[model samples]
Target: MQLSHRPAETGDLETVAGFPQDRDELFYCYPKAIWPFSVAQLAAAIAERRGSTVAVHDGQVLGFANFYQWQHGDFCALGNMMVAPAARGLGVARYLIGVMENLAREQYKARLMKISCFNANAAGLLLYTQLGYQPRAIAERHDPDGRRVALIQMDKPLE
Candidate 1:
């Protein structure tokens, strides 16, 4: 299927979440990025173009992600990257990440890019690293579900 990425629309969730979709099913994106995602919070994410983007194909959302610019610097972060279960393994995540890296440089003038994923998300950690985000730091924390975990911080120079 043909796919494209664009800034998220507040209404995107309507058709996307219409079938009683369970947002919490996504546990690999961020251990703390709202266990139960809400449409309101998602809408607010793009209120100022805080860098939220959605991937769509044939008029339905295939994935979503947000690349965030630090309020006071040339560095950026990534979060909320989730793909619909059926859309997995189709290059959607890589596309969004590439788009984010481009936005970080062209739009935000970001010199550095950072991302964090809990240790439990092996696939995600591997994905980011394979995409060129290097391991830089690690911080331990607990998930809302009380699972002890480590937030592995990864980064790369956007220059």
Candidate 2:
């Protein structure tokens, strides 16, 4: 099986967004009502910055990743990263991160990269940690319905 990466197109919006929801309930926290925003917003963000959003694989968009500048020139953040259920163990997530890293360094000149995941997401936290991210901080806040959740922040510096 061969894998490839390409810039995400507007047509891939739905596919990119739906990948996360396809996962088991424990892996995702976004409510069904708010899940649609994942695709719509990502598509708009990608269209606005054509080169920043990338889709993994040649035929189907198994996963998508993107980055945005944060705080100032030196800091950046990785946005929604999702892999299709069928493609989870194929290294799609890691490949997407590689693409984001390249974009951050080459296009944005970002020296630091950051990402935040809910504390309940063990897989995501482990993935980021294996890729060199270190714990930075944590924020405890209530969701729209007033349920408390812990958001863990992680960061890595690029020389």
Candidate 3:
């Protein structure tokens, strides 16, 4: 099935909230959220973003994302991206990134797109690298459990 992108709505919040199934997944997606992701937590995060977007197929929310920082004509930074565990490897994530890139360019006239990933999120780091995002910075940090990790900040210039 082909995935289509659109603005996320209140109805999609529950499904998106359920995407992160564990503490690690939750930290990877949204570090601020508590374990056992809840609608309220998702709602609050979405409230602080430049709205959210979803990748869907036949009306089902397959993936979800948002721009945590948007500076018109400058850049739009991605935030809280998560694909349903069941939908992994189906291109849902690539589709969401493309959609958000277009939104950042066509709608906000941004010149660059930014994404930050933790070292533990191997899939995300690989995907973003393959998508042409270059690492602009890497900071040493600690996870909630005090494990050391690298926070990679990557950027792709909109051409």
Candidate 4:
């Protein structure tokens, strides 16, 4: 399947909300959200976030991600990433990340792109690092179950 990334539409939230397959997977994307993600929850998020993007093929949403801490020309941070279970091994995440990086530079004039991954998401951390994102900081945050997890912040220069 040929996946491509584009700016997210309000209609895409429902499909994007359903991307997380389980409680742990949902928590990996947004720790505050409960299991069985909802469109209302994702809608409110997209309203507050910047540059929401979705990876799609044949009009089906395969992945979604967005920026949160947007500081104009300084930096932008990626958050709330989700990949459909079936699209996991097809490089959808990388494609979305590349699109987001381009959006950050072209649209936001950002000098850097940042992403945060919890320690539980080993695959995400590895992928981001392999994509040239280097760890810059670490912070402690509680999961939905009240378990402490290290939130690793990574960044890549967009210039």
Task: Choose the strongest candidate by TM-score.
Answer: 3
For each candidate, what is the lDDT? 0.72, 0.68, 0.90, 0.88
Look at candidate 4 and tell me the lDDT of residue 151. Answer: 92
Give the number of the best model, judged by lDDT: 3
TM-score of 3: 0.95
Tens-digit lDDT track of model 1 for 38-62: 5655555556347888888887798
Cα misplacement distance, residue 108 of candidate 1 (Å): 1.0
Q: Which pairs clash in model 3?
A: none
- Candidate 4 similarity to native, TM-score: 0.95
Expressed as tens digits, the lDDT of each residue in 1-112 for candidate 4 is: 7878778997887788888988889888987787778999899888888888998897789999998789888989998989998889689999899989999899889999
Q: Write the per-residue lDDT of candidate 3 for residues 89-125, one digit (tens) a residue.
A: 7889998999899999998999999999998889899
Deviating ranges (above 4 Å) for candidate 3: none
lDDT of 3: 0.90
For residues 1-159, what per-residue lDDT tens digits would candidate 2 score against the true structure?
Answer: 356777777677777666765333323433222433566555556654334555556677787766543544586787666678788868888887877777677777778888887877788899989999999899986554567878888999875
TM-score for all models, in order of appearance: 0.82, 0.80, 0.95, 0.95
Give the Cα error of residue 19 in candidate 1, in Å.
11
Runs in model 2 deviating more than 4 A are 22-33, 36-41, 44-52
Query: Could you tell which candidate, 1 or 4, scores higher by TM-score?
Result: 4
